Structures are given as C-alpha cells and as structure tokens.
C-alpha cells in the first residue's frame, strides 16, 4: 500500500544544512510530481517545494527560493530536500506527498526545529 | 545378489529417471505461466451506449479568424509567411483572397492579448451550427447533449460522455433506428483556404468519429475513422469486454480505486499517453497544448516552433520509452462495421434544400448522417484464463510420482528418518 514514509530529518542549529528523504511506495512515482509541505504548528499544510516527475522542473515558494534544493531520485523512490541556511521561521513538521495526486494517506512527517 | 534382485534394482533406477525427467518438465511448464483464452457471447437486454466523440476535419472556421487572431497565430495555422505577409497566391480565389487581405493589413494595429484556448473555443466549429437533427432511440435529441472536448483536431464534441454528472444512456433494441442518428452539416464553405501544399495541407472534407467507452478520454488523432458528406453511414457496434491476467501470467495493470495518473481520475491506456505527454511538456518548458489537462498556462504560438512540436517529436520518435503504459486488466471496447447509403434521395432533395434555405448543391456536398447503433443486444467477452495452477501442479506431480515409484511425501519423510537413524 501507499507508505510514502519520510525520514532523515532532525532538529538542527540555525543557519544549518539538513537533508530530508522520503520513500514513496504503493505507486509508480516515476509519473508523479512530488511536493514538500510545512505543517505550521496550529496551521494548515503549506507547500514548500515541488518537482516534476522527470526532475527537470523545480518549483519553490517565496521563502524557499534560492535557499532550498529539491532533488528527485528515480528508481530509488527517494525525494531529497537539500535544506540550507535554516531559520526558526521554518520550524515545522515536514510532509512529502504527490502534489497533483493528492488523494493519499499523509505520512507521519519528520520534525525539523531550527533552535540550536 | 541374484538376477531377480539385480533386475528389480535396475528397473527401479530406470523408472526413477523417467520420474525426474517428467517432474522437472511439469515444474518448468508451470513456471512458464501459460494461459489460454476463453471467448463467449453473453446476451443482454440492455447495453450502455458508448460515448461518441466526433469533430470536423477543419480545425477552425475561416469567418471567425480575426485581425488579432491572424497576427499572433497567423503563422502557426498556415496562412501567413515568416515575415507576417501572405505567401504566393497564384491559385487563389479572388473573393477569398480579398476577404483575407483585408484581414492582414496590420496598419497601425495595436495587438490585444491572445489565448490559444480561447481561440479554439471561438474559431472552432460550433455544434449548434453543424448539428441539424439529433435523435436517440426515436426521441428528439439536442445540441446541449454534446459536451465540448479539445483534441489535436481542435474543438470536438462528445455524445453520451457520462461526464458532468449526466447518466449514461442505455439502449434497449438493436438495429438501425434504435441508436444515435445525427444529421450534420460540415460547413464546407468555412474551411480554411489552401493556397499552397505545405507538409500538413489536407484536401479532405467530412468529419472524424471515435466510439469509445465513457471511461477513457477521446483520442481521435489516432483512433478515429472518417465519414464523408452525402452519405448515410451506418456504424454497427459490438461491445467487447476483455479480461487480462496480471503478472506473471500477462502484462496488465490491475485496476485500483484510484488511478496512477497525475491528471486523470481513472486509468486508461489513452489517459496514460495523454498524461505522459502533458507531464513531459509541463516539466520541459512550462506550457501545455490546448488539448492537455492540468493547470499550466497554454503555450503561446511562439512556443510551438520553439517548445511544442520539437519536444513532442523528440518524445515520440527516439525517446519513446519514458512512459510505459500498462494496459488495464479489463476494459470494454467497441468493434464496428461501416456501411453507406446515398444522401439525399431525389425524392427528398428539395425538402432538405428548403428546410434549410440552402442550395440543393450545398445539401448534396455538405450533409452527412451518422447512424450509430448496436447490431444485436449481446456482448462478446474475451478472457485470459490461467492454464495450469498450483493445485493442478500438485496433482500432476503426485499422480506420476505414485505411478513410477509409488511414493509420497510421507515415504520421503520415512526414508529421511531411516537415513538419519543409520548415521546416528
Ligand atoms: C474490470 O473487470 C471487472 C471484472 O473482472 C469488472 O467488474 C469491472 O467493471 C471492470 N472495470 C471496468 C472499468 O470496466
Ligand atoms: C435563406 O436564403 C438566404 C441564404 O443566405 C438568406 O438571405 C435568407 O434569409 C434565408 N432564409 C431563411 C428563411 O433561412
């Protein structure tokens, strides 16, 4: 079934680099746009980054522009978010789900907090 | 060590060779995963009428292309040269060329914004104009029954699409007058003029039809058939439901509650290809042709010689193995048989050419009549059946193990017991 587990994310110091990985099972991700989301504590999920099923096209948000890198690994069911220059303003649990194929169980999400 | 003992031991070790040479054959045969087909004809009192997509072989009308439309997209739609000027017009009708030249002045012309989707939805052929009388099972039909779809042929229309919440229409009797029966006016005088033969210049008239199940989207560009003006065209359909076998018996994608497609609610061998093309374009240069789903902005006509036709040709020709579309393990398809009758008879020529105010010649060369119906109310079913299952494997192995050496698995267990008891 659709697992889409996310791993590799932990609390980091401010102005630090972290790498987030997700393992999408249950579907052929080869043909699935993959997006990252921020669940702000008490707020709704907000998209962080999106990458095309082919990996050529990368979309970012306002604050994510030129600060985050999204990488998609084919045939390895892994999506890599190359976080850099983190700040406390982005302290939230991170969810990876297909962007356009939204009707799927949402994974637990790895919490990254940029305090120290 | 007598001759009886030696003969019996030799016969046992001879009957044990055949046993293995046959058991390994059966095991290999099972691991080939063979299947066989089962054809059947199930009679039914009701069949859901297929969706009928169709559209004119003319992409869009000539009386609706405007000054603005001819500027942004004049070069694309094969009317203007590279330098925004008309090409050689030696074989040009005087009135047609004058009604185009006044549309190609561009004298102090301030262009307005252009949207390709809006252009197709305006310059494309209108069903309220083409459709002269629709009928379904003898009840009067309407032009509001046809849903607009956009394909590579432009603005096409789908009947009984089953979309927008409308209920799919059933049919209760076979035969000619018990299905869709539409008289169309292909409007041959709206066709774009042909000055010179380009690569894609088309000299044909008539419309193109596709008959498909309501699940899959229309794909007229490859799956359609043409019908010609001045001809009652009977299309006798045949419903055909196909069960396929998933791996390892076959290669098919068992249908789930959701689809494995980013842009389509349900999965189809055609939805897969349209999804592949749309994803490739959107990920490559951030625009989609008018006929693709999604939300990306439509390609401007500049992005068709720089972004659409090149990338699509690249994907089709040499890059063809990006998207492997597994064909669903069951689907209903519609076989068809075409036949023709002349329209209109000399008896009723004047009646039509008075019912429409048009000339008798016009009616002769512009009016066609599709007549789509089920021949008989039954459907063919074509199933793939697993030819050799595990219970059959165990039966065929046991029945010959007990024929050659009379053993069982318990006999093997007893032999292992005895061999252990010796070694102890
Ligand atoms: C697929 O086949 C099953 C039976 O094997 C049938 O019940 C189902 O309606 C089929 N799916 C579609 C979309 O026709
Ligand atoms: C039909 O005849 C000509 C065709 O253009 C037109 O002037 C006239 O108004 C039309 N009449 C009707 C009743 O359609």
Author numbering:
A (entry chain C): 5 to 120
B (entry chain D): 39 to 462
What's in the article?
In agreement with other ASIC structures, hASIC1a is a trimer with each subunit ECD resembling the architecture of a hand. The TMD shows a closed pore and the domain-swapped TM2 helixes that define the GAS belt of the pore. Three Nbs are observed bound to the trimeric channel, each in contact with a subunit at the end of the α4-helix and the extended loop of the thumb domain. The loop is longer and more twisted in hASIC1a because it has two extra amino acids D298 and L299 (DL) that are absent in cASIC1 and in all other known ASIC isoforms. These two amino acids are essential for binding of Nb.C1 as their deletion from hASIC1a eliminates the signal in immunofluorescence microscopy. Two Asp residues in the extended loop of the thumb are involved: D296 interacts with Nb-Y108, and D298 with Nb-R35 and Nb R105. In addition, R317 at the end of α4 interacts with Nb-F58. We posit that the absence of Nb.C1 contacts with α5 is the most likely explanation of why Nb.C1 does not change function of hASIC1a.
ASICs are proton-activated sodium channels present in most neurons of the central and peripheral nervous systems. Association of three pore-forming subunits, either as homotrimers or heterotrimers, forms functional channels.
